[PDB]
Design a protein around this ligand. Structure first.
Ligand SMILES: Nc1ncnc2c1ncn2[C@@H]1O[C@H](COP(=O)(O)OP(=O)(O)O)[C@@H](O)[C@H]1O
Ligand SMILES: Nc1ncnc2c1ncn2[C@@H]1O[C@H](COP(=O)(O)OP(=O)(O)O)[C@@H](O)[C@H]1O
Ligand SMILES: Nc1ncnc2c1ncn2[C@@H]1O[C@H](COP(=O)(O)OP(=O)(O)O)[C@@H](O)[C@H]1O
Lengths: 367, 367, 367
């Protein structure tokens, strides 16, 4: 009996055993379905396709993301990947040990009950629990105080924490980055005349985001520095072998996190959504936060995200104070790393909710 | 020459002539600005938008409230609505007759000088005066003694009055209700999975507050009475025509006024902030107050606010005494009603401060 | 066996061993409790928090003062700090040596019995005694005659003494200064537009009182001298790093002690509450008092308290007489300094009341 912990963060969903520095199985969550007539009537490949079964064979498939924004749009496709995650991929019996399932802070409650539901009546699990995407970032870093910053594909959220006491009233969540950061790119490639739009090809575009973006670090010149003297085009090769030329939007896609008037849906932006999350915290309590904001987003490995938060918060915020954005490279597994830590440790062991608790009243005890 | 009286209480700002039972122009105070590219290069609608000019066309606009908490955050956007209030809306020349401008009790002084300022050097007014949000509630009710209770969008405050003699040391002001009552709702809708967050949509949410809230009236059962036997969901239609289902939080939003540990910012709560305002009043003087508390808040039409103050003060307070919360339905214009009364009447006529007084020393005579 | 002596004066409560020039442990008396959801289920910090355990971590906590005005409002929270004061902080076994516990002159008797009670049946003490806040000020100064003046946070009181013979009929106690001097400041900061109000932040404000107040020293000009020519604003930095500007109320908060018509609760004021305490003393006996008034208040280090008592009593009082306000800088520990003196000395040794005396009849012998 040992805890297997998994997150729903869309993108690559991530699952592994407790007491480990990295999960065993990391694969993207997608259900593919064939969109064309079956000809080899027998073939030798499945009806529908999950994960890298699907991710390998793309264009022939159409791709559906069950995780939509932390919230899950369809259940029945979703439970497949859980059905898969445990059996194939990492191979584990249904009933061994509890499972910590991380999950988004502000999303609706009807999200996690049916989730706990299908963690019980369909395939029974030895108890269960659901943590918060944020808090596990600290259990990873070993921090106690501090304000996280998450993006991932699922949703962008930050939850300032001080000594294991959350500040719910200060929880700021804007639904952005992730997919919506790529979708803006497929929007903005046609600038260069590459029309990529289909659901299967999206994950070619995502790879372009992966390899070359960075972050503006003061884009004014950076728009000029692109146009005027262009050494910064980085050509790229995509699976057919056709050339690409980019570099005007290499930084312009991640730049949207600092001005979501480019994406067109105006809310805040990630740099000052933390500051406004601080301002709602206490006058005293906020001093240390400026030092401690951990930012494990799972999107943001961007080379120079830190720089432009270091840059931008200083324009905001008390001048006399030392603002420190810690940027652990080991993140992007962090919200999982919290799991294999928080679960494998004890004083949490009684905090699993046994099937008895689901037997007590219902799924409704999660709240 | 006849007095036009106006209040700043954010929400719907309210202005009309003296000697009338209701103001002529009532519109919400917002400056809208277009957030997207102008395409119809000529169109036929203004650069920026105030009030119902803006309130009509929302999602395209971004909305800014110059009144923030009685205190005004930006002046230059603010003076627009005054510039507008007099010219369009109710149409009045700059210089006719003085104007009574109501204003919050405890807010900083730098608030009302520049206000008086721009009531003079930019567009000159035939004198001026600024009353208190509280006191005009009595001039409306015709009461003399009694403790008001105000909420409105601007700020929550109560000022016990006994025979035209205020008790400043007993003035209790907690900054709450109003906007911060709605902002908690947009927080708490996502409970049901409706993510409404944008500045333009907020005033859809505000309408939901408007139509269906009431007040807990003993919420313990009321949380159970919601969950267990649910007949109380009231569905609602919002301008697209999409359905909504509510009723778990219908009473849970106004409930925050009685436990501002739900909003997360802990101060007091409105029921016992009056009692604690009484306790700071005299031992004798307090008997009648328990009978007289008028509560014209401008937010609180809630069906059953009175009940739960009647309920809660009795749990507090001397038992042998008869506590009476009068709940005039004509309120929400009350703090204006005081104006058209106090101004149109006389023995106040010498109390206007003429431009001469502003010419005497400066704006500083208001204190 | 050596006497440990402690005072309840709220503010910083102060305890140390007999025969020393200053107590070992000086910390503020507060019981903090977490007001938000526990998230780090294990953390590593206590259920509830006392003193600097609490004083370090503020905004997350809510703060309760068991000492209210010398009178103690809640016992069970109170006994914690005593439970703490002896064990942690200065570390001492329950039963070693008696303890002198200072305490307010005019407060109710039900105050000190239960106090003596919980000094016995819960944790037994080798006898006990309770002196007066006033008298120990002289045992410190080594004076015999003279009228004290106390403020502290607990209560303001002055007890004229002549050769170890108190004048009870002349004891003047007005409940003021201390907390109620700060609470007036949080009232009067919003003048400048700083809304500080929450229980945890209060002790930021208290620090502002600490560093910059002084005393009017003839405020008429001093209100003008502030307004007209302003060099006297002293900006300040508070734990976030946000700027403050003050100086109109720097002297206006302590000024309330000379006109408690600013605080709104009208009693007397500290300058002429001593003179009226003198007038109730004998015609002969009063000559020397005017020379001897010691004023160890524990609040009043204010730079120029002495000046405005020197100033004000002269306006009162016989002209031909030399009025001398001695202002020992070593005070604010004084009422403790009396303890380590009066206890460590002898001829008081038989005046401890042994558990036998509590065994004789009950706690009731204190009177
Ligand atoms: N090096 C990188 N640079 C930019 N974006 C990245 C990089 N690595 C991953 N991403 C984006 O971040 C996402 C991380 O997804 P995931 O961590 O599962 O979301 P969540 O944080 O909600 O779990 C990926 O889907 C990818 O789109
Ligand atoms: N029937 C109602 N039920 C609940 N809330 C209401 C109702 N009518 C108005 N409100 C809220 O009360 C506010 C009143 O604003 P307003 O009176 O201008 O503030 P002030 O009292 O400071 O002038 C409105 O903005 C609205 O949010
Ligand atoms: N330098 C200072 N200037 C002004 N006020 C002070 C200063 N030092 C302390 N105080 C106030 O005086 C209080 C002293 O509290 P304390 O001496 O415990 O009360 P008591 O005199 O009843 O024991 C402090 O809480 C603080 O508010």
């Amino acid at each position: 009996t040992t805890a297997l912990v998994c997150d729903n963060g869309s993108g690559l969903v991530k699952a592994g055993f407790a007491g480990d520095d990295a999960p065993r199985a990391v694969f993207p969550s997608i259900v593919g379905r064939p969109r064309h007539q079956g000809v080899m009537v027998g073939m030798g490949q499945k009806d529908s396709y999950v994960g890298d079964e699907a991710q390998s064979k793309r264009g022939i498939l159409t791709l559906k993301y069950p995780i939509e924004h932390g919230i899950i749009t369809n259940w029945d496709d979703m439970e497949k990947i859980w059905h898969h995650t445990f059996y194939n991929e990492l191979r584990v019996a249904p009933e061994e040990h509890p499972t910590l399932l991380t999950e988004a802070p502000l999303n609706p409650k009807a999200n996690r009950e049916k989730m706990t539901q299908i963690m019980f009546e369909t395939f029974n699990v030895p108890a269960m629990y659901v943590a918060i995407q944020a808090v596990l970032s600290l259990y990873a870093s070993g921090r106690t105080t501090g304000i996280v910053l998450d993006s991932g594909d699922g949703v962008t959220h930050n939850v300032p924490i001080y000594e294991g006491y959350a500040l719910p009233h200060a929880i700021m969540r804007l639904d952005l980055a992730g997919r919506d950061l790529t979708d803006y790119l497929m929007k903005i490639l046609t600038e260069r005349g590459y029309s990529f739009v289909t659901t299967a090809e999206r994950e070619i575009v995502r790879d372009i985001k992966e390899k070359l973006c960075y972050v503006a670090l003061d884009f004014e010149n950076e728009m000029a520095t692109a146009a005027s003297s262009s050494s910064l085009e980085k050509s790229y090769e995509l699976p057919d072998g056709q050339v690409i030329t980019i570099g005007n939007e290499r930084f312009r896609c991640p730049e949207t996190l600092f001005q979501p008037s480019f994406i067109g849906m105006e809310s805040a932006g990630i740099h000052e959504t933390t500051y406004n999350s601080i301002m709602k915290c206490d006058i005293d309590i906020r001093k240390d936060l400026y030092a401690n904001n951990v930012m494990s987003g799972g999107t943001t490995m961007y080379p120079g995200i830190a720089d432009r938060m270091q840059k931008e918060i200083t324009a905001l915020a008390p001048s006399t104070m030392k603002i420190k954005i810690i940027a652990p490279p080991e993140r992007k597994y962090s919200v999982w790393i919290g799991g294999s830590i928080l679960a494998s440790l004890s004083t949490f062991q009684q905090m699993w909710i046994t099937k008895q608790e689901y037997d007590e009243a219902g799924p409704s005890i999660v709240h």
